[PDB]
Symmetry: C4
Subunit: 421 residues, 4 copies
Amino acid sequence: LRELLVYIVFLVDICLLTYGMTSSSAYYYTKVMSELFLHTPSDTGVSFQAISSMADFWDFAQGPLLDSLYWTGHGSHSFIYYENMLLGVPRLRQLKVRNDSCVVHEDFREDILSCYDVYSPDKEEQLPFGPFNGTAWTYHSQDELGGFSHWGRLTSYSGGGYYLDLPGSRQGSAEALRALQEGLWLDRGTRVVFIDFSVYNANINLFCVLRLVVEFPATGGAIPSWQIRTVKLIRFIVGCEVIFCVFIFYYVVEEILELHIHRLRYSIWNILDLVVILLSIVAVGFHIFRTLEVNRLMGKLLQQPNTYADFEFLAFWQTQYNNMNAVNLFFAWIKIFKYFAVMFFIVFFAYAQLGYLLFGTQVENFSTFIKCIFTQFRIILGDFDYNAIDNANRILGPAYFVTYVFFVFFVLLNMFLAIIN
Amino acid sequence: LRELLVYIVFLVDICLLTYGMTSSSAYYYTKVMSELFLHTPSDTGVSFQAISSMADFWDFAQGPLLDSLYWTGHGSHSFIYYENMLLGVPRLRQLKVRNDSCVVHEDFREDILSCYDVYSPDKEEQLPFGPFNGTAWTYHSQDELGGFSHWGRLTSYSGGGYYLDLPGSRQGSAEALRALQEGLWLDRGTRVVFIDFSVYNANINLFCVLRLVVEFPATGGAIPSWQIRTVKLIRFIVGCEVIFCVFIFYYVVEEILELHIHRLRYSIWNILDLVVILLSIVAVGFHIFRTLEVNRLMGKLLQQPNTYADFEFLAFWQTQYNNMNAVNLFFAWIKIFKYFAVMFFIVFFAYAQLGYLLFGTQVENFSTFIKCIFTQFRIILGDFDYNAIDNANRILGPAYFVTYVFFVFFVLLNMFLAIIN
Amino acid sequence: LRELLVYIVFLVDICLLTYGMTSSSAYYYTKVMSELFLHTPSDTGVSFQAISSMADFWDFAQGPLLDSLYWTGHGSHSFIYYENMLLGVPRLRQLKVRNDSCVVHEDFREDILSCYDVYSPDKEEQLPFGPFNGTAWTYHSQDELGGFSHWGRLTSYSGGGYYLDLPGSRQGSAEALRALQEGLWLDRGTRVVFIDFSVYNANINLFCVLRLVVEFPATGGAIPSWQIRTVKLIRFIVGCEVIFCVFIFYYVVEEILELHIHRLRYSIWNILDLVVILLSIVAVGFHIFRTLEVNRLMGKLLQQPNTYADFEFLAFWQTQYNNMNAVNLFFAWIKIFKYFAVMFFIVFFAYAQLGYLLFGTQVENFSTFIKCIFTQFRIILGDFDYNAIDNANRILGPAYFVTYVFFVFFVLLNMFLAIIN
Amino acid sequence: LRELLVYIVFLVDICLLTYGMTSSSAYYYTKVMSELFLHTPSDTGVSFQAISSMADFWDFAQGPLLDSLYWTGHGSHSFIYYENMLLGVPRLRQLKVRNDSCVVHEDFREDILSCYDVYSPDKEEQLPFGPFNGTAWTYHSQDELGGFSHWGRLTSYSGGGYYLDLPGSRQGSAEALRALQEGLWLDRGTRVVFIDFSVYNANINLFCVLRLVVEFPATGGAIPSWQIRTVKLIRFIVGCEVIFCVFIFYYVVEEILELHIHRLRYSIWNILDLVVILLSIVAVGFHIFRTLEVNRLMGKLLQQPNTYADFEFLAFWQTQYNNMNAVNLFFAWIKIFKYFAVMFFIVFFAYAQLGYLLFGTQVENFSTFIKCIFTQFRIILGDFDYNAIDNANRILGPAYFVTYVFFVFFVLLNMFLAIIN
Ligand SMILES: *[C@@H]1O[C@H](CO)[C@@H](O)[C@H](O)[C@H]1NC(C)=O
Ligand SMILES: *[C@@H]1O[C@H](CO)[C@@H](O)[C@H](O)[C@H]1NC(C)=O
Ligand SMILES: *[C@@H]1O[C@H](CO)[C@@H](O)[C@H](O)[C@H]1NC(C)=O
Ligand SMILES: *[C@@H]1O[C@H](CO)[C@@H](O)[C@H](O)[C@H]1NC(C)=O
């Protein structure tokens, strides 16, 4: 039709555009790259998904990441598999928090005088502490480095300081970090230690970026997380987009001509048009930023080759970019169709609240309030761990469980008997 | 309204009161604290969740709890992570049972003369047995120590004797326990060995208590259990409670004025009022007991610092306290609404009884009668282990299973056909 | 009533009789006893649930069963935990099969001349093969030993020969089995090697028996199985039974007086009476056999203490005895109520047959025809392993799976629409 | 009947024919054979299901496959268990791809000059590269070897070159492969390395074949797969088939006599006849090919015993043969009965597409488009891994999950309310 088949042409263009850079050879690259640094055992046998102390972080960052980064085809650019190059050098930016962040209660004094705190956008340390200026002991601002607010497991973070751009040799990084041990760069009151680098292979034209987080909470310990993102970086790779750039102006006019002479009563198909139109401009804006930044970053590197080229910013934005391409593509696929629970939610969150207060600690599920909707929703499906509800209190755990399951069955049965006719 | 909005004000006060001490930074403290002592391997590789013998308990209590408690910021109060202090010293109270507890049957004599027994509140040993008075070999009563009845995995316990308050140094505790080996303090007929201590950090104001149970049943072996509880201990932290203290007297009067001139016919909303009123007085009584006992326990410790300050009593009562706050909070959330199976249960417990007698041993599920309701109820949901029903007898296991599942489907189908109209 | 309340008295007597010997302290004894021999690692690290070769069976039977049986309270009767005695000595009976059991096909000769076979009640070796008479190299009949037909994993067995009653000392059993290695007692064509012994504790009066099977199939390898059974052995322990003996004669008369003057038309409540009556005589017959055999077996042992007292026979019959007590108890509990699929089964077994022929090997589920009803029934519930259906052929696996699940949903939906009214 | 009972006779003949060679002793042979080479640890502890690097492939192929193939009843034909012979010798055929396969983009030059590629039927290396002619360094065509197109995990393959027929001794294969290391036969740009051999036992007359794939993708790493197939090879074993050969001509005539004088309107029972008739000729053709090829392969081996007898071709065709026997047997069992979703699929594949683009990498499920129908169909059943949807992005993962599950429940509920009457 003159109005429907145009949208199919718009579909197949926006389909072929999203799949334009959809390497079908990416998730095995994520396998090799994830399970080369994460799951590798050390000499004493510590891996990144199973780090919890602090003295073994300095075994992880000297055995399975220093003896797992520097190979010597092979030249001097440190191909990590022999099939993908290390571009730039990693860096280790550390947040800290300060001693008088909050005050201890007066029952405990005289021994417990220094009182660190949970991380907030306030309460950091904008102060140097080490022996002499070496960049790794001096704070640097949020806009001297430009790194966006990382989102870890507990709370968000910022563009913190104390970073150390690594050298590019096996003996060099060991003589850096071993001399960094006795300085105690990881002192008592750290909140996150990052380590960031990235690698690129020729064979399928994919940049993969690797962010490795070792966060030391206020309670103690270490609860690690990783973030491996693998996308195209680059892109006849460009001519399919100039027909896609037409459709934004093609559809905003057909929207506003209905909106210009609109009546005083405007359905959800209008916002269905709007949510897929507004994401398109955000998508097409990112290409210019990529073509500036990727070129700037390799221009920064072919002279002065020992420097951290920051790929994490446009890596995160490229990842949210093709996430947004997936989401507006899905909205386009749903747009092809253009041809009581009040007594349930307030008790649903009540059982969630009961599960959060009973099962506070002792379970790493049920542990914030949101996760007490996701767990308590998975229980409606059938994924549950009763051997850690019954291993928590032994009296109210099963008492919660049996009557919650009977409540779910009662409320799923009650609605249908009067709605069947 | 004048009767409904007051209850919302009562809700938001009782909500903010329960969340007054709801550290959102507690379950990672339970992670670090649990997985620092439980899951730590020894030199020969024994962990607390995987202890079963008796000669390896004395490797667990000399490698991963003696080389995992005494670190040397750092002073002399034994910060276990470098971020949480060891307050007091642990202790090791041991129950025992006596030789003539029950008599062997007459077919077996002449070799099997000593006959220990399952644990009961009777049948203990109120007798010293070691070389000389050192507190670890002499019984102490239930009210010389004051410890409540612990509830282990098999049956309850009492405030038993034989305890050993540990010293506060690395060489000292090793010279204690190594000299305690050749005395054979853990002899043949023990029923529980406890070890209790607790740690507190400044950074978020939480007391976590740790009770570690190694119980040696009448059959032999060891089947360990732990109990880690982590709560506030302390608490402008107090002024939100004086408005909450008003509402008890506010609502008991409005209950009894209906009850004073009551008719001769009193619904379940009355006991709905009663169950949330009666828990409130029990809740507000605990604060005075905390403010006495926490102060007494740190008064006991700043002079004579080498002593066990008993936190387990008010720790258990604080834990049942905020459990009760969760339960009456849930009853308040359910109280916002104030604006045939006879041929199924007797066969349900019959299949439970059949499963208990067929699957007696060989499965650590199905193993008491209650657990044959919880397992045989989980089978209605979908969590089951058919590779240990079929690995038990191979003939009646599947015969039980298939016809029980067909019975559940038949009785879940039969009720709906006549109730649909 | 005069007919109903008598049955309740019969219930409570038959309930208290079955629970007369229902040690509530048995499944932890099965835990300690199972996980003391099964899951124990060797020096080179082989456990009984993970044995598959033949040269490591002789590490399992020299490290974690010879250094895990002989401890030196402690006398000379080999308490294995220090809390349960080793009564008698173990023995190792071996079946074999003969060289000309079946003939190879004529394409393969000249190299493959000896042709052993799958086990049958025929085709054994009633022949000695070792150097000299020592009982371990000479066949013994099915009625020289009296052992019942064991049922292993593949097929049944018989009372085979070649057994070796072990000595009762640490050096003695090692000098037995090490001298038994170079004789090659486990030669190429074995089908089962057993090892049987049993242990008894005073503390709760339970005999546990342990049968450990290492079967070498015709294909090769070893696919082990165990059989641990733990029951009373013994039994004021006897006077509750003389009232139970009354009810057999009480109810057979009331059955036959209805059957003597019966009409020419006899419902399933009659066979409901019969199945619970006929099991009662079988139950009460076993007590006399226990009181003879248990007494005979300890009479065999207090003189000549170095001999295998065969507990496995009445152990198996005691286990099927209290299984039958569970089953007729369940029938009594179901008897308190005395106050199209033709187009589904033939395709059900057809999909079972398709799954057996597609998924023949490569999966240890789906592997006989029966197990292709149990697996293909578990798929209706939700326990399935799609990562070994898709890891078998990759083309017909999912093709079987998706349309079988759609068939199950179609046939579970089709029956209800016409049966709702 | 004269038309129905003939088909039952045809059933029981075609049943007994398919089960004619249905070794009930095959899946334990697959257990021993799979878990003898796959799951065996090396000296440094690498197994075949857990190989990912390249320098540890040369530990897998020198410890747990060179010290796990050559045993020294025992003669000189290398019985691998002592109960199944090694017939022939293994071989190691390697595919490669060439340097100028695709060109790098112009932003990256001067360092990244060699650019290998994903595997295709084009782009190989038909060129020798090693020092001198030894067969292992020279390409051989697809029809010099005759090996069919293997189907690995990523994409299909072909009959590639570079193979090395192994010798038949322990010292010989080690002196082959250790001298093959310094030549670097596994160089940077390999795509698959195969290793193929097969073993046969006398005891139940089964040939099992073993294909072991170590594929090095374009990204790097190694993602291994295996293929173990175990069938009869041979077959009074032949006389049951001459009655089965009658039924093809018996039923094609009864089909075409209906088809010769057929009306101008031909139901799906006709193609139901056709799909079970046409597979029968394909089945009966394979027997002649087996009787030629099995005889040729053992004729190739009794003289010149050090050669690879290719069993993989007729092994794959025998496996698809008894797969086809299972499928037409199932169609025969279904043939005994001869006596809106348009708004669901386009959003079903839309959610699949959203899951493929969100969950591209980071999950080895959800990873191609097809697997986003199999996973997103398993979610309707209940097998899902929410701890890798929530561990992927943390924002859209649960947002996808909750509304997809609510969509599935809404569309499964909506169809029944109007179809109930
Ligand atoms: C941090 O603590 C140290 C003592 O350990 C103290 O000297 C210093 O002044 C404190 N600095 C801040 C910013 O709290
Ligand atoms: C306990 O047993 C010992 C022998 O081991 C005996 O000497 C002692 O009297 C017994 N004591 C009790 C209280 O049973
Ligand atoms: C078994 O095989 C051996 C050769 O290994 C042969 O000497 C002996 O006669 C055979 N015995 C039987 C009973 O098959
Ligand atoms: C492969 O690369 C090498 C350099 O490593 C080069 O000398 C050779 O000519 C290339 N051959 C092909 C076929 O690309």
